Amino acid sequence: MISLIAALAVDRVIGMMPWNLPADLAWFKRNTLNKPVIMGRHTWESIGRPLPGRKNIILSSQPGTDDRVTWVKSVDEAIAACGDVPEIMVIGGGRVYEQFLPKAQKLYLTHIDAEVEGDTHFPDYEPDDWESVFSEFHDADAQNSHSYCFEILERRHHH
């Protein structure tokens, strides 16, 4: 099964960080550890080093040479490279989320209370097609710059 995981500012702006949220990074790690992660080449270059404890699959029509990750050229190849696993995590960026959304059955979202200047957005999804099965709000604190709300949604309908 395919899931997307993303952190969204107001207006669904995503980035590679205008905010400083170690709690969100802990949420990201907890929910991706021991699962393959699929990302586009822009996201890969922004991370710079393979995420530990996860198979790192990079979707790009023009692969790099880095032997530390697995390079694939299509959504279908990305999925095949993951093989028989319970859950595949798609970690962005904008275009990769857009291509994978139709195949996804679960969303892990962090809704951040920040207005920011970026131009890359998380895909449009029809809220009526999803059910909110978890939500938790957290205030900002000495370690986290903004307030945020974790949410998990499960797909109920497809169009």
Ligand X SMILES: Nc1nc2c(c(=O)[nH]1)N[C@@H](CNc1ccc(C(=O)N[C@@H](CCC(=O)O)C(=O)O)cc1)CN2
- Binding residue for Cl ion, selected from 4, 15, 27, 130, defined by CB under 5 A: 27
Helix/strand/coil for 151: strand
Is 43 a binding residue for Cl ion by CB under 5 A? The answer is yes
Q: Out of Cl ion, Mg ion, ligand X, none, which partner does residue 67 contact, by CB within 5 to 8 A per kind?
A: Mg ion
* Cis before 93? omega within 30: yes
Alpha-carbon gap, residue 47 to 141, rounded angstroms: 25
Is 36 a binding residue for Cl ion by CB under 5 A? The answer is no
Q: Out of Mg ion, ligand X, Cl ion, none, which partner does residue 141 contact, by CB within 5 to 8 A per kind?
A: Cl ion
Q: Which is nearer to Cl ion, 94 or 125 (CB)?
A: 94
Cα dist. 100→95, 111, 132, 145 in Å? Answer: 9, 20, 19, 30
Q: Which is nearer to ligand X, 34 or 74 (CB)?
A: 34
Closest alpha carbon to 143 in 31, 30, 27, 19: 19
Contact residues for ligand X, defined by CB under 6 A:
5-7, 24-25, 27-29, 43, 47, 51-52, 91-92, 110
